[PDB]
Design a protein around this ligand. Structure first.
Ligand code: ANQ
Lengths: 108, 122
């Protein structure tokens, strides 16, 4: 099972931007418990969202999770300059976790 | 308040073993799962496995079952990952990351990371 993300996406500050997480085995479901993790420069990692839509405590409410079509999605509603980073998603397959390649989000 | 402190940089020879540590604090150690993740340049993140500090129960990525050994020490609130039969493919930065698992599964706090370089003695 292979998880694919957008390689890199551009947005402007204040705009809304959606990252996606695709499964090779088919459509992503709640039983994949999609996770989203953020990497900022200097290898600073922060869990954002797991189980599709549940935010970790302290995580800004502008990050939200959902299923759109056949994919899990991270939407950022009102992108901030500090949100410029790499976003990894992770799907659960019933006995193991698989990370996608990660998306580089640039904020103009 | 919550903090995960992983051990300092490591320099080990091919074929040897290494035990990396992850000291947890600012919370009840046994209440959260601990994961270990592998970061190599150009290869993104790679799940190694998770442990449950309550009972030591584990779950591994199949590709790392012959490679990684997860344990915990409850008294010192420290999770360990031993890597064995080391090669150059093991050279990476390894992270511990805790997870909440009631009704949903999400990571939150991640450790700073520990760098391993598998290097021959010239
Ligand atoms: O059910 C599990 C489980 O045993 C495990 C382990 C590690 C990571 C997980 C993410 C989502 C869901 C699940 C995870």
């Amino acid at each position: 099972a292979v998880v694919t993300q957008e390689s890199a996406l551009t947005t402007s500050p204040g705009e809304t931007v959606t990252l996606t997480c695709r499964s090779s085995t088919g459509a992503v479901t709640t039983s994949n418990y999609a996770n989203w993790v953020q990497e900022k420069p200097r290898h600073l990692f922060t869990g954002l969202i797991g189980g599709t839509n549940n935010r970790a405590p302290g995580v800004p409410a502008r990050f939200s999770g959902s299923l759109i079509g056949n994919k899990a999605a991270l939407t950022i509603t009102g992108a901030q300059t500090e949100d410029e980073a790499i976003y990894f998603c992770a799907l659960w397959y019933s006995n193991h976790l698989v990370f996608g390649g990660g998306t580089k989000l640039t904020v103009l | 308040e919550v903090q995960l402190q992983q051990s300092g940089a490591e320099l080990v020879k091919p074929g040897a073993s290494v035990k990396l540590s992850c000291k947890a604090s600012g919370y009840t150690f046994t209440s959260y799962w601990m994961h270990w993740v592998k970061q190599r340049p150009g290869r993104g993140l790679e799940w190694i496995g998770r442990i449950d500090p309550n009972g030591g129960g584990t779950k591994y990525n199949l590709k790392f079952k012959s490679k990684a050994t997860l344990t915990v020490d409850k008294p010192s609130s420290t999770a360990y990952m031993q890597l064995s039969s080391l090669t150059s493919e093991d050279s990476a930065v390894y992270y511990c990351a805790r997870m909440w698992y009631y009704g949903t599964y999400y990571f939150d706090y991640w450790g700073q990371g520990t760098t391993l370089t598998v290097s021959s003695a010239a």
